Amino acid sequence: SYYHHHHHHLSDFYDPRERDPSVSRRPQNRQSDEWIRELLLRGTIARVATLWQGEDGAAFPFITPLAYAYRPEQGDLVYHTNVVGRLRANAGQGHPATLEVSEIGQFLPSNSPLELSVQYRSVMVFGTARVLAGEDARAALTTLSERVFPGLKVGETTRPISEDDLKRTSVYSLSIDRWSGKENWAEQAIQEEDWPALGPEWLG
Amino acid sequence: SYYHHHHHHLSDFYDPRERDPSVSRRPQNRQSDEWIRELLLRGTIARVATLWQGEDGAAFPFITPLAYAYRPEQGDLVYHTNVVGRLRANAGQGHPATLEVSEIGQFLPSNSPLELSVQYRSVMVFGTARVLAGEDARAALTTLSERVFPGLKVGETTRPISEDDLKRTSVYSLSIDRWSGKENWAEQAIQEEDWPALGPEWLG
């Protein structure tokens, strides 16, 4: 800044900047629905949070990382896991679930301490998960497997999915209600001009 | 298997295997407390789930990926995020939180469809998160920053953390109650001998 410079020799928000008019103007790092679709289609690992009744009776979340696949026409995501708690905290044959998918990039150094950050893209999906049975479960597992092992074909590359396989596996469909997407994927963190710049080891 | 082989020319759980006597005998992929400590000390990204009151009044979880640091002596993990919902679903000045840290390896192909899997290590930490203030918040942010940017020193590499910085940042301490660790990090998925083996493209 001028003031600091002049003091040594003895607001940025309103001053000129460059703007690409095609960049998202959404506040709070939020992204479009199409962006969210695309991120979900290209990911292969998610974390799912569901609520379990704890010792004090209060609901609390688990977080389980797992393979998943987004099935856009059906409006769901599929996954399998045999992780459970004691009782689920909710009524009914399905349960509310939150699913998160992210792409984590690099840590971005700065000479301004609260500008230190990590590149990210993250989606939260809110909906209702239900366990699948029979052919619904077989088809979901097949889509998942063939999605995350591209080129693998169930019944050719692998033996077919048997009735025993199904009996021993909890396979879910998370039917989507709402979703929320965020990105902050700068090439460089914001720096503070009036403090010594980062040395070459940090950005080079 | 013999039976399949003999039929072509016309239980494994109890038959011989090799066992390294130093391998964990814990069921359900569970790991020791020391293993959990070590994984938490070496990670830098976590996902945190906290509960918010939704439209229907029921608590539901968010999942936010963020940088973190484990402070073993204090018995907490620290992180910062300005993500919120409307009202938290709980009473008091802190809130229950679940934090997950994982290491995700490779997808492991198999000719047995329910042996398809991903290498993983995952910890869930259960405790209570509280927002920090003043010097407590400054020290937590400094530990975090210096942990995830090794060699960076707050106040040398960066300008010091100011009172304005603190006012604009929600900095948390998750005080640990309990934790749970799992690993399944095989070099190869289990295969089915009685189906054609995977071609060289899969494991080579």
Automatic annotation (TrEMBL), chains A, B:
Region (Disordered): 11-30
Domain of life according to the entry: Bacteria
Pfam family, one: Pyridox_ox_2
Protein source organism: Deinococcus radiodurans (strain ATCC 13939 / DSM 20539 / JCM 16871 / CCUG 27074 / LMG 4051 / NBRC 15346 / NCIMB 9279 / VKM B-1422 / R1)
Annotated residues for binding of (R)-lactate: 80, 145
Compositionally skewed regions (Basic and acidic residues) per UniProt: 11-23
SUPFAM superfamilies: FMN-binding split barrel (SSF50475)
Ligand binding (pyruvate): 80
Listed name of the protein: NimA-related protein
